[PDB]
Design an enzyme around this catalytic site. Sequence first.
Site, PDB file in Angstrom:
ATOM      1  N   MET A 151       0.806  -1.207   0.000  1.00  0.00           N
ATOM      2  CA  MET A 151       0.000   0.000   0.000  1.00  0.00           C
ATOM      3  C   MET A 151       0.853   1.277   0.000  1.00  0.00           C
ATOM      4  O   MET A 151       0.550   2.237  -0.711  1.00  0.00           O
ATOM      5  CB  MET A 151      -0.932   0.005   1.215  1.00  0.00           C
ATOM      6  CG  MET A 151      -2.055  -1.029   1.155  1.00  0.00           C
ATOM      7  SD  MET A 151      -3.027  -1.137   2.695  1.00  0.00           S
ATOM      8  CE  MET A 151      -4.028   0.375   2.644  1.00  0.00           C
ATOM      9  N   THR A 169       4.079   1.764  -1.007  1.00  0.00           N
ATOM     10  CA  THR A 169       4.939   1.953  -2.177  1.00  0.00           C
ATOM     11  C   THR A 169       4.272   2.834  -3.230  1.00  0.00           C
ATOM     12  O   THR A 169       3.102   2.636  -3.553  1.00  0.00           O
ATOM     13  CB  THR A 169       5.345   0.584  -2.776  1.00  0.00           C
ATOM     14  OG1 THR A 169       6.031  -0.181  -1.774  1.00  0.00           O
ATOM     15  CG2 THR A 169       6.247   0.754  -3.984  1.00  0.00           C
ATOM     16  N   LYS A 221     -10.040  -5.178  -4.492  1.00  0.00           N
ATOM     17  CA  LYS A 221      -9.959  -4.068  -5.446  1.00  0.00           C
ATOM     18  C   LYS A 221      -8.485  -3.654  -5.569  1.00  0.00           C
ATOM     19  O   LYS A 221      -7.874  -3.230  -4.576  1.00  0.00           O
ATOM     20  CB  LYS A 221     -10.789  -2.878  -4.934  1.00  0.00           C
ATOM     21  CG  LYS A 221     -10.593  -1.585  -5.729  1.00  0.00           C
ATOM     22  CD  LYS A 221     -11.333  -0.413  -5.091  1.00  0.00           C
ATOM     23  CE  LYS A 221     -10.929   0.907  -5.748  1.00  0.00           C
ATOM     24  NZ  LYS A 221     -11.610   2.099  -5.156  1.00  0.00           N
ATOM     25  N   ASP A 229      -5.487   5.881  -8.286  1.00  0.00           N
ATOM     26  CA  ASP A 229      -6.787   6.419  -8.658  1.00  0.00           C
ATOM     27  C   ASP A 229      -6.756   7.959  -8.722  1.00  0.00           C
ATOM     28  O   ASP A 229      -6.709   8.630  -7.682  1.00  0.00           O
ATOM     29  CB  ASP A 229      -7.830   5.949  -7.634  1.00  0.00           C
ATOM     30  CG  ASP A 229      -9.250   6.290  -8.033  1.00  0.00           C
ATOM     31  OD1 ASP A 229      -9.474   6.689  -9.200  1.00  0.00           O
ATOM     32  OD2 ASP A 229     -10.146   6.156  -7.167  1.00  0.00           O
ATOM     33  N   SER A 246     -13.719  12.193 -14.111  1.00  0.00           N
ATOM     34  CA  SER A 246     -14.375  12.757 -12.930  1.00  0.00           C
ATOM     35  C   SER A 246     -13.197  12.905 -11.958  1.00  0.00           C
ATOM     36  O   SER A 246     -13.165  12.300 -10.873  1.00  0.00           O
ATOM     37  CB  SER A 246     -15.374  11.740 -12.365  1.00  0.00           C
ATOM     38  OG  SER A 246     -16.389  11.424 -13.304  1.00  0.00           O
ATOM     39  N   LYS A 304     -10.156  13.809  -9.359  1.00  0.00           N
ATOM     40  CA  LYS A 304     -10.087  14.153  -7.935  1.00  0.00           C
ATOM     41  C   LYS A 304      -9.432  15.512  -7.683  1.00  0.00           C
ATOM     42  O   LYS A 304      -8.759  16.057  -8.558  1.00  0.00           O
ATOM     43  CB  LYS A 304      -9.284  13.094  -7.177  1.00  0.00           C
ATOM     44  CG  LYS A 304      -9.942  11.744  -7.086  1.00  0.00           C
ATOM     45  CD  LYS A 304      -9.018  10.759  -6.358  1.00  0.00           C
ATOM     46  CE  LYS A 304      -9.685   9.417  -6.135  1.00  0.00           C
ATOM     47  NZ  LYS A 304     -10.907   9.540  -5.311  1.00  0.00           N
ATOM     48  N   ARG A 347      -2.394   6.047  -3.953  1.00  0.00           N
ATOM     49  CA  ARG A 347      -1.465   4.995  -4.361  1.00  0.00           C
ATOM     50  C   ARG A 347      -1.891   3.753  -3.562  1.00  0.00           C
ATOM     51  O   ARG A 347      -1.515   2.635  -3.901  1.00  0.00           O
ATOM     52  CB  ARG A 347      -0.006   5.362  -4.007  1.00  0.00           C
ATOM     53  CG  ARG A 347       0.315   5.452  -2.494  1.00  0.00           C
ATOM     54  CD  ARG A 347       1.788   5.847  -2.263  1.00  0.00           C
ATOM     55  NE  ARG A 347       2.134   6.191  -0.876  1.00  0.00           N
ATOM     56  CZ  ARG A 347       1.979   7.398  -0.325  1.00  0.00           C
ATOM     57  NH1 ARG A 347       1.380   8.375  -1.004  1.00  0.00           N
ATOM     58  NH2 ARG A 347       2.365   7.618   0.928  1.00  0.00           N
ATOM     59  N   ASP A 383      -5.059   2.797  -3.210  1.00  0.00           N
ATOM     60  CA  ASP A 383      -6.407   2.405  -3.632  1.00  0.00           C
ATOM     61  C   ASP A 383      -6.429   0.916  -4.019  1.00  0.00           C
ATOM     62  O   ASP A 383      -7.428   0.399  -4.523  1.00  0.00           O
ATOM     63  CB  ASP A 383      -6.902   3.294  -4.776  1.00  0.00           C
ATOM     64  CG  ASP A 383      -8.439   3.415  -4.823  1.00  0.00           C
ATOM     65  OD1 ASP A 383      -9.121   3.311  -3.767  1.00  0.00           O
ATOM     66  OD2 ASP A 383      -8.972   3.641  -5.931  1.00  0.00           O
ATOM     67  N   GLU A 419     -14.956   3.757  -9.687  1.00  0.00           N
ATOM     68  CA  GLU A 419     -14.378   2.688 -10.506  1.00  0.00           C
ATOM     69  C   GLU A 419     -14.131   1.356  -9.804  1.00  0.00           C
ATOM     70  O   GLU A 419     -14.107   0.297 -10.455  1.00  0.00           O
ATOM     71  CB  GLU A 419     -13.082   3.168 -11.199  1.00  0.00           C
ATOM     72  CG  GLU A 419     -11.768   2.987 -10.401  1.00  0.00           C
ATOM     73  CD  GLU A 419     -11.700   3.817  -9.121  1.00  0.00           C
ATOM     74  OE1 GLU A 419     -12.190   4.969  -9.117  1.00  0.00           O
ATOM     75  OE2 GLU A 419     -11.140   3.317  -8.110  1.00  0.00           O
ATOM     76  N   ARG A 430     -16.061  -0.303  -7.835  1.00  0.00           N
ATOM     77  CA  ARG A 430     -17.231  -1.163  -7.972  1.00  0.00           C
ATOM     78  C   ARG A 430     -17.335  -1.733  -9.390  1.00  0.00           C
ATOM     79  O   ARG A 430     -17.833  -2.854  -9.580  1.00  0.00           O
ATOM     80  CB  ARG A 430     -18.516  -0.444  -7.512  1.00  0.00           C
ATOM     81  CG  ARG A 430     -19.011   0.697  -8.393  1.00  0.00           C
ATOM     82  CD  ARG A 430     -20.007   1.573  -7.634  1.00  0.00           C
ATOM     83  NE  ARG A 430     -19.325   2.453  -6.676  1.00  0.00           N
ATOM     84  CZ  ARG A 430     -19.924   3.370  -5.912  1.00  0.00           C
ATOM     85  NH1 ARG A 430     -21.244   3.523  -5.939  1.00  0.00           N
ATOM     86  NH2 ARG A 430     -19.195   4.117  -5.089  1.00  0.00           N
TER      87      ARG A 430
HETATM   88 ZN   LIG Z   1     -12.236   6.233  -7.543  1.00  0.00          ZN
HETATM   89 ZN   LIG Z   2       0.862   1.407  -3.437  1.00  0.00          ZN
HETATM   90 ZN   LIG Z   3     -10.921   3.881  -6.188  1.00  0.00          ZN
END
Ligand SMILES: [Zn+2]
Ligand SMILES: [Zn+2]
Ligand SMILES: [Zn+2]
Lengths: 484, 242, 484
Positions: A171, A173, A250, A255, A260, A262, A271, A273, A334, A336
């Site tokens: 997570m 990295t 997921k 992301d 749309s 962020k 990073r 996500d 995304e 979902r």
């Molecule tokens: Zn998203």
């Molecule tokens: Zn990462």
């Molecule tokens: Zn996401």
Amino acid sequence: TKGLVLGIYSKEKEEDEPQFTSAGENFNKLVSGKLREILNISGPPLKAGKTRTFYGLHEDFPSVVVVGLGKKTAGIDEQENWHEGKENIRAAVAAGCRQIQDLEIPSVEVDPCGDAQAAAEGAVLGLYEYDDLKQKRKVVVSAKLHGSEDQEAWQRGVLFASGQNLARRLMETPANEMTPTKFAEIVEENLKSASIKTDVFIRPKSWIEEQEMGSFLSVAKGSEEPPVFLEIHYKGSPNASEPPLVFVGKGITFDSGGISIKAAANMDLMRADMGGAATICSAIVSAAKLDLPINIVGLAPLCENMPSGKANKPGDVVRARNGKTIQVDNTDAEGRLILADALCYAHTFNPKVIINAATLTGAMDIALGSGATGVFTNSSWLWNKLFEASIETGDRVWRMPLFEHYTRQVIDCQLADVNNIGKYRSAGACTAAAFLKEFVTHPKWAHLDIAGVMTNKDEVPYLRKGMAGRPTRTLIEFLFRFSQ
Amino acid sequence: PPLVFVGKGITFDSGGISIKAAANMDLMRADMGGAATICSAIVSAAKLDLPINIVGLAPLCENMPSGKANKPGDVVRARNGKTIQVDNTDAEGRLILADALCYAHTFNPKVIINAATLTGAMDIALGSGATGVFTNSSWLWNKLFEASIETGDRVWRMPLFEHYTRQVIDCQLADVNNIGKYRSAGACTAAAFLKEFVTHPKWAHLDIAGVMTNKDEVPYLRKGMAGRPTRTLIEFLFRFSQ
Amino acid sequence: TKGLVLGIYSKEKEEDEPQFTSAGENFNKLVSGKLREILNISGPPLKAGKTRTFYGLHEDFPSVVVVGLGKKTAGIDEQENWHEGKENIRAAVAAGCRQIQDLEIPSVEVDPCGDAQAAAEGAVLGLYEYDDLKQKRKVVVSAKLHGSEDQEAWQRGVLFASGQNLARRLMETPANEMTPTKFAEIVEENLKSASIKTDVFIRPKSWIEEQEMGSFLSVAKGSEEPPVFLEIHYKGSPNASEPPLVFVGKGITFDSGGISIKAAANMDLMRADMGGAATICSAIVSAAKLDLPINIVGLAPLCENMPSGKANKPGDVVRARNGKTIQVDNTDAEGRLILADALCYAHTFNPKVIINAATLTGAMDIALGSGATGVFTNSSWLWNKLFEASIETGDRVWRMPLFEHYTRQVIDCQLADVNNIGKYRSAGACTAAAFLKEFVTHPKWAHLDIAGVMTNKDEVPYLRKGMAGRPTRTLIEFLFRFSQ
Ligand SMILES: [Zn+2]
Ligand SMILES: [Zn+2]
Ligand SMILES: [Zn+2]
Ligand SMILES: [Zn+2]
Ligand SMILES: [Zn+2]
Ligand SMILES: [Zn+2]
Ligand SMILES: [Zn+2]
Ligand SMILES: [Zn+2]
């Protein structure tokens, strides 16, 4: 040279002085009462999670850190839904180890504190830091059990904590290093080291296309980074035909929100996500290390969500593997989309249970923050199993509703069978869960929205600031108990 | 010993100096929903002549900006002597509830149940699907839950953890801060704030902000203020009396 | 019982071991070398600002905290514009005192560290905490000089630090307690305790109206809280007719922005919008305590800025005491309005210099943050005096421009002589300064925009999190040197 971490409890009303653990009592005896004498000289007693350091008490241990363990008999706290004693130990031991590290001591022996697994978890989770990319690093500390009586439990703690630390590494990295392919290769090597009773398939885009996973593909296309569908098998059951437990995660390596897009503030945290994939894959690696007598399958669709001349456009309609159409009203919803295809594929294994994890919604964070992982499930038996496991690990879960009330808000769709964002802004985590349920027919399914427990500031005492890797240990515990 | 109900009665909430946005601010005329639901439940209990003693407490006022209004950073003293740092004047419901909850203990009640259209976070959390219930008593949670199955006006439990308390007692000037350290878990930290004013073993806090209105979710309620979960409260009282 | 804070320097190349201060060396001797022995056993040497605690070395000092002072001969740092050695001492001593306090020790003796004033400043600024309104409070620590050789310097440090702590208290206190009247009464009592050669006049609204201070009045009216114009005189010069130095401070006890209302996030910090008044009044209290041989006048217009049916309305035109008209385009640019009237009144004293302080603009914060106070002045002699004083105190100042370029942007006004906000959004601190200059004809005037140094998180090591009271000590030092 070598440091020592010892615990002391809060004094009970009829005691004349606070009690050391067995190891603390033995060490004090070894130094003719010098530890108790100096602790008394230093002043006020040590309370839960507090530490104090004493120098030169023994030639083998130039630095001795005593840590407050709180009430010795602290058990399950009815109000907090966790085993309090275990939590006190993890926090106390982590604090002690951080002091040893600040003193730049390379090795430390740790008091089992009446629960070696919890002590090991405090030390291993507590010392962890992702510093591969920095010139300046703290001293690497090697923590081992003090004594030789609680070996299996200490090692069990090291194993559980290591699984969580693997999730944290993945997570933390940066996404330019931790791409879909890289994440798959790191998980592949860790699973193979854990057991030879494994198979790993890093499925390429051509396979994804063959599997008609149009929803997942629609998300991946906006980026230049190749997508992969990670499929892992751990054959631990004595019977090869035994139906497996399936975990789905997921894996959005980064992301940006896509078209749309962020906001800029703190977007770097995205990073992580792919936290859903990190936690379920790490849980499986650990299960393999423990050689649990069960068959498990892990599925993790992996890709980036980026804006470009090929990206998903708001209003676009995509076809999921199951034939259902989805109106992509917001390209940032995304997770979902990729999960719809992975959940459909999960049914092909005729599993015993299906558990998915995802850093899915900001709404979950607004709902419970980092206090507990939100769990949506159509099975109270499954809710209960996850809940009981969480009491033991201290990495709490809290149930959230799966009501048609929320489903109505996502199937009310202008162009397709289901809309990827609800009619209203209310209950975002609940409508996201309802969306996922439209792709599940299994009777024992649980969806874990881990968006709120993605990071840690100072809430969990034994985790330094950064990606948390929660709730990996709760998943490992669930599997262990399930196997028994 | 009586059962005590407490309700937030802000007849209109503009947010005060920490002023609200203009869009749909008219709905804040219902920021007294907590008082409305608990008082109506008691009226009904009286109509039914339930064989129980009940006390209803409802602090009532408006939250407006002016040359005399609460100013962010101001420190106020609750009835119980605790000091509160008012960092955001729009987190006013918990301020008036702190005093009403303290007063509630004077009745030596059997249970203390409060209701309030307290946080936008609750709406983001569960929407209009169910009323969020924070309670230190699983017996009380269960009684409210069973009553809700019957009425259809659902309740859902939310956590009362020290994790959230830590975020409101970490305060620069006073004993407790009226808004948490972070933006996460707003309904949970608000609940934690309220708990600092409760010592009773059977207390439940109902955050009804998400069920304040109805569009078309509950088929039998036309569009407008919902009056939820009044029937669940009446049912709870009925069963309690039996 | 009693704690002890001792300093040790960084080792120099030709030294065999890091050197203790004289006091540290004497204490080690007193305990037969036990301090050096244990410090060696504990590991790595202590670097600047770091601390380590040793227990039971002497019956009179059960807890001894050694603190790293850095390089012994550290003098003025050409790149940082401050005396480095003094800064190292303040930080080290503060860290040591906080450790003593954590151990709940009520009294501590502090090593002078080669500079008793700096050591005293570190201890007194370091231990400060505004906790009058909390049930839970840390132990009150009484810090005194270790030894009897550096008394005047230690006491000088206590005096300087106390002045800053008074400013911090006034700034930190919530606005419902620290009203215009209350602030005036607290300053009045502190000045009177400092010296009998003082006069204080808490001027009421009727006096303000008599003085035709329409600009100040326009700001005050929106609130129900009565405004006051605090005027203080310290007659320290041997010649009563000697022209005084005049200090002016913005005293907005709470700033909501008025009709041009502020955003909600962190608006609580605006209780410190009276920081300008706090710092200049505290500096004068200290000057009186020191009995500096100079005449000083302090002026502080005090009121709240609130929205109501009587408040300033954007576009309103008000008349300053000097007859100039001001177009109030933004009611949140109120500090400059009240200052226009106070600066005009300041000229009536035929002063030697006029120095004003104000938490004036968010632009100043965007410009320099908490690194240094921005100083706008029409006198390089005055800039230099403030700059030199700041090197000594470590509470840095940085010059900002007073150019007609900025003036043009505020006198370009639709309805009046001057507009209270510039034509553009650029250089907000500079145009605010230009606005103030339209009310000054004096040849030695300096405007200090302290908005960026209003608070401290962890930037200044010796100040706990909260209102900073900066740059009170730089003002005291300036006055001291001026008097000599
Ligand atoms: Zn998203
Ligand atoms: Zn990462
Ligand atoms: Zn996401
Ligand atoms: Zn409000
Ligand atoms: Zn309200
Ligand atoms: Zn103040
Ligand atoms: Zn302003
Ligand atoms: Zn202002």
